[PDB]
RNA sequence: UAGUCGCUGGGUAUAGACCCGAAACCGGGCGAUCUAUCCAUGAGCAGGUUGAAGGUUAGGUAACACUGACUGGAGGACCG
């Protein structure tokens, strides 16, 4: 998984009436942080496709959570596409 | 019951043995200023084409891919 220090760290800018861990600030961008740091083990273990099928499972679900923000909230979408180093 | 040693011729033997004439064989040298390779040290290859590997960049991807563009200037390469 992610680091025990980190998975409780990254929520500190996702707060937005802080008790939310459910809006797509969290399941995009905890999950975007899952994308950006678990690249490491692939370089050593390139013969195990079980771990990047989870990557494509949630980067679609991130894009699915981008897809609902296409219509529900375009303005807070700019906080996602403008930030995080996307695209 | 006649032979011997000359001398002059005719033959013969051994010597190049009437004269001329092989290809070749062997022994000592001479020669790689030609040529065949090699060794050292020098230098010659007008001009025009082609556009390999590498780079850079954009684009694309989990980084690897992978496609453009620009650059690059390879070759018992091409034309002369």
mmCIF file of C-alpha atoms (C1' of nucleotides) in Angstrom:
data_model
loop_
_atom_site.group_PDB
_atom_site.id
_atom_site.type_symbol
_atom_site.label_atom_id
_atom_site.label_comp_id
_atom_site.label_asym_id
_atom_site.label_seq_id
_atom_site.Cartn_x
_atom_site.Cartn_y
_atom_site.Cartn_z
ATOM 1 C CA UNK A 1 0.000 0.000 0.000
ATOM 2 C CA UNK A 2 1.023 3.602 0.617
ATOM 3 C CA UNK A 3 3.159 4.691 3.555
ATOM 4 C CA UNK A 4 1.450 5.039 6.942
ATOM 5 C CA UNK A 5 2.881 8.538 7.308
ATOM 6 C CA UNK A 6 1.836 9.458 3.763
ATOM 7 C CA UNK A 7 -1.725 8.112 3.470
ATOM 8 C CA UNK A 8 -2.718 10.265 6.449
ATOM 9 C CA UNK A 9 -0.593 13.178 5.139
ATOM 10 C CA UNK A 10 -2.060 13.762 1.693
ATOM 11 C CA UNK A 11 -5.647 14.218 2.961
ATOM 12 C CA UNK A 12 -4.582 17.507 4.595
ATOM 13 C CA UNK A 13 -5.386 19.496 1.430
ATOM 14 C CA UNK A 14 -8.389 17.378 0.382
ATOM 15 C CA UNK A 15 -10.448 18.462 3.351
ATOM 16 C CA UNK A 16 -13.373 20.692 2.215
ATOM 17 C CA UNK A 17 -15.433 20.390 5.435
ATOM 18 C CA UNK A 18 -12.660 17.988 6.522
ATOM 19 C CA UNK A 19 -14.810 14.990 7.548
ATOM 20 C CA UNK A 20 -15.125 14.129 3.858
ATOM 21 C CA UNK A 21 -13.013 11.212 2.774
ATOM 22 C CA UNK A 22 -15.656 10.425 0.123
ATOM 23 C CA UNK A 23 -15.785 13.265 -2.425
ATOM 24 C CA UNK A 24 -13.650 12.879 -5.601
ATOM 25 C CA UNK A 25 -10.922 15.076 -4.139
ATOM 26 C CA UNK A 26 -10.026 11.957 -2.167
ATOM 27 C CA UNK A 27 -10.608 9.022 -4.519
ATOM 28 C CA UNK A 28 -8.900 10.865 -7.312
ATOM 29 C CA UNK A 29 -5.956 12.227 -5.450
ATOM 30 C CA UNK A 30 -5.159 9.687 -2.812
ATOM 31 C CA UNK A 31 -5.461 7.436 -5.821
ATOM 32 C CA UNK A 32 -3.394 9.763 -8.012
ATOM 33 C CA UNK A 33 -0.759 9.556 -5.279
ATOM 34 C CA UNK A 34 -1.121 5.774 -5.521
ATOM 35 C CA UNK A 35 -0.273 6.176 -9.231
ATOM 36 C CA UNK A 36 2.751 8.381 -8.695
ATOM 37 C CA UNK A 37 4.616 6.488 -5.976
ATOM 38 C CA UNK A 38 3.972 2.814 -6.749
ATOM 39 C CA UNK A 39 5.799 3.126 -10.075
ATOM 40 C CA UNK A 40 8.895 1.961 -8.127
ATOM 41 C CA UNK A 41 8.361 -1.795 -7.856
ATOM 42 C CA UNK A 42 7.778 -2.206 -11.618
ATOM 43 C CA UNK A 43 11.419 -1.468 -12.479
ATOM 44 C CA UNK A 44 12.572 -4.355 -10.284
ATOM 45 C CA UNK A 45 9.500 -6.566 -10.871
ATOM 46 C CA UNK A 46 8.543 -6.184 -14.527
ATOM 47 C CA UNK A 47 7.402 -9.787 -14.795
ATOM 48 C CA UNK A 48 4.252 -9.378 -12.649
ATOM 49 C CA UNK A 49 1.261 -7.845 -14.411
ATOM 50 C CA UNK A 50 -0.981 -8.303 -11.384
ATOM 51 C CA UNK A 51 0.049 -4.965 -9.889
ATOM 52 C CA UNK A 52 -0.531 -2.694 -12.876
ATOM 53 C CA UNK A 53 -3.928 -4.178 -13.615
ATOM 54 C CA UNK A 54 -4.940 -2.455 -10.397
ATOM 55 C CA UNK A 55 -3.317 0.690 -11.784
ATOM 56 C CA UNK A 56 -5.458 0.609 -14.928
ATOM 57 C CA UNK A 57 -8.479 -0.347 -12.795
ATOM 58 C CA UNK A 58 -8.389 2.873 -10.797
ATOM 59 C CA UNK A 59 -6.891 5.280 -13.349
ATOM 60 C CA UNK A 60 -10.024 4.418 -15.304
ATOM 61 C CA UNK A 61 -12.030 4.905 -12.104
ATOM 62 C CA UNK A 62 -10.152 8.184 -11.634
ATOM 63 C CA UNK A 63 -11.220 9.032 -15.190
ATOM 64 C CA UNK A 64 -14.688 7.762 -14.252
ATOM 65 C CA UNK A 65 -14.493 10.159 -11.312
ATOM 66 C CA UNK A 66 -13.234 12.748 -13.774
ATOM 67 C CA UNK A 67 -16.253 11.879 -15.954
ATOM 68 C CA UNK A 68 -18.802 12.722 -13.254
ATOM 69 C CA UNK A 69 -17.018 16.014 -12.582
ATOM 70 C CA UNK A 70 -17.387 16.814 -16.296
ATOM 71 C CA UNK A 71 -21.050 17.603 -15.653
ATOM 72 C CA UNK A 72 -21.595 17.969 -11.900
ATOM 73 C CA UNK A 73 -18.834 20.494 -11.112
ATOM 74 C CA UNK A 74 -16.634 21.991 -13.835
ATOM 75 C CA UNK A 75 -15.260 24.653 -11.482
ATOM 76 C CA UNK A 76 -13.778 22.306 -8.883
ATOM 77 C CA UNK A 77 -12.633 20.152 -11.825
ATOM 78 C CA UNK A 78 -10.087 22.920 -12.504
ATOM 79 C CA UNK A 79 -8.637 22.183 -9.053
ATOM 80 C CA UNK A 80 -7.954 18.652 -10.344
ATOM 81 C CA UNK A 81 -6.827 19.193 -13.946
ATOM 82 C CA UNK A 82 -4.910 22.386 -13.139
ATOM 83 C CA UNK A 83 -3.161 20.713 -10.235
ATOM 84 C CA UNK A 84 -1.571 17.311 -9.452
ATOM 85 C CA UNK A 85 0.516 17.266 -12.639
ATOM 86 C CA UNK A 86 -2.131 15.644 -14.839
ATOM 87 C CA UNK A 87 -2.374 15.150 -18.634
ATOM 88 C "C1'" U B 1 113.079 -79.135 -88.733
ATOM 89 C "C1'" A B 2 112.841 -70.332 -86.363
ATOM 90 C "C1'" G B 3 112.404 -67.050 -83.913
ATOM 91 C "C1'" U B 4 112.992 -62.086 -82.151
ATOM 92 C "C1'" C B 5 113.570 -56.632 -82.114
ATOM 93 C "C1'" G B 6 112.870 -52.535 -85.188
ATOM 94 C "C1'" C B 7 110.706 -49.547 -89.269
ATOM 95 C "C1'" U B 8 106.290 -48.505 -92.637
ATOM 96 C "C1'" G B 9 101.305 -49.493 -93.536
ATOM 97 C "C1'" G B 10 96.016 -52.247 -92.469
ATOM 98 C "C1'" G B 11 92.979 -53.444 -88.101
ATOM 99 C "C1'" U B 12 91.746 -53.446 -82.640
ATOM 100 C "C1'" A B 13 91.728 -51.711 -77.255
ATOM 101 C "C1'" U B 14 91.797 -47.339 -73.878
ATOM 102 C "C1'" A B 15 91.567 -42.168 -74.085
ATOM 103 C "C1'" G B 16 86.842 -36.275 -76.550
ATOM 104 C "C1'" A B 17 89.059 -40.737 -80.853
ATOM 105 C "C1'" C B 18 86.214 -38.506 -88.206
ATOM 106 C "C1'" C B 19 83.726 -33.533 -87.445
ATOM 107 C "C1'" C B 20 79.314 -30.826 -85.770
ATOM 108 C "C1'" G B 21 74.676 -30.960 -82.824
ATOM 109 C "C1'" A B 22 70.487 -31.954 -77.946
ATOM 110 C "C1'" A B 23 66.671 -31.581 -74.369
ATOM 111 C "C1'" A B 24 68.811 -32.540 -69.738
ATOM 112 C "C1'" C B 25 71.876 -33.799 -64.875
ATOM 113 C "C1'" C B 26 75.289 -32.097 -60.918
ATOM 114 C "C1'" G B 27 78.668 -28.515 -58.153
ATOM 115 C "C1'" G B 28 80.262 -23.077 -56.708
ATOM 116 C "C1'" G B 29 78.290 -18.388 -57.415
ATOM 117 C "C1'" C B 30 75.062 -13.998 -59.170
ATOM 118 C "C1'" G B 31 70.268 -11.789 -58.812
ATOM 119 C "C1'" A B 32 63.636 -9.396 -55.456
ATOM 120 C "C1'" U B 33 66.528 -1.865 -59.456
ATOM 121 C "C1'" C B 34 61.191 -6.346 -63.164
ATOM 122 C "C1'" U B 35 57.668 -9.124 -60.595
ATOM 123 C "C1'" A B 36 55.205 -11.877 -56.284
ATOM 124 C "C1'" U B 37 54.154 -11.229 -51.070
ATOM 125 C "C1'" C B 38 55.932 -8.811 -46.694
ATOM 126 C "C1'" C B 39 58.349 -4.766 -43.386
ATOM 127 C "C1'" A B 40 59.342 0.550 -42.123
ATOM 128 C "C1'" U B 41 58.357 5.578 -43.360
ATOM 129 C "C1'" G B 42 56.142 9.221 -46.402
ATOM 130 C "C1'" A B 43 51.384 11.191 -49.745
ATOM 131 C "C1'" G B 44 47.486 10.701 -53.520
ATOM 132 C "C1'" C B 45 42.286 10.280 -53.996
ATOM 133 C "C1'" A B 46 38.327 17.239 -58.673
ATOM 134 C "C1'" G B 47 33.325 17.390 -58.107
ATOM 135 C "C1'" G B 48 28.335 15.764 -57.195
ATOM 136 C "C1'" U B 49 24.663 12.349 -54.577
ATOM 137 C "C1'" U B 50 22.676 8.987 -50.729
ATOM 138 C "C1'" G B 51 21.252 9.885 -45.694
ATOM 139 C "C1'" A B 52 22.970 4.389 -41.111
ATOM 140 C "C1'" A B 53 23.760 4.587 -35.865
ATOM 141 C "C1'" G B 54 23.485 8.359 -32.374
ATOM 142 C "C1'" G B 55 21.533 12.820 -30.603
ATOM 143 C "C1'" U B 56 17.689 16.905 -29.724
ATOM 144 C "C1'" U B 57 12.696 18.090 -29.577
ATOM 145 C "C1'" A B 58 7.652 17.821 -29.765
ATOM 146 C "C1'" G B 59 3.508 14.020 -29.487
ATOM 147 C "C1'" G B 60 2.337 9.477 -26.956
ATOM 148 C "C1'" U B 61 2.521 6.236 -23.070
ATOM 149 C "C1'" A B 62 2.853 3.310 -15.487
ATOM 150 C "C1'" A B 63 8.894 5.115 -16.946
ATOM 151 C "C1'" C B 64 9.659 0.946 -21.581
ATOM 152 C "C1'" A B 65 7.040 1.464 -25.992
ATOM 153 C "C1'" C B 66 6.091 3.797 -30.349
ATOM 154 C "C1'" U B 67 5.189 7.839 -34.476
ATOM 155 C "C1'" G B 68 6.490 13.026 -36.420
ATOM 156 C "C1'" A B 69 10.221 16.989 -36.954
ATOM 157 C "C1'" C B 70 15.120 18.760 -36.741
ATOM 158 C "C1'" U B 71 20.077 17.368 -36.420
ATOM 159 C "C1'" G B 72 23.827 14.012 -37.480
ATOM 160 C "C1'" G B 73 27.162 12.216 -41.409
ATOM 161 C "C1'" A B 74 27.849 5.885 -41.652
ATOM 162 C "C1'" G B 75 29.287 2.857 -45.803
ATOM 163 C "C1'" G B 76 34.988 -3.161 -48.793
ATOM 164 C "C1'" A B 77 27.695 3.013 -50.352
ATOM 165 C "C1'" C B 78 26.327 5.583 -55.430
ATOM 166 C "C1'" C B 79 27.675 8.775 -59.991
ATOM 167 C "C1'" G B 80 32.144 10.738 -61.811
#
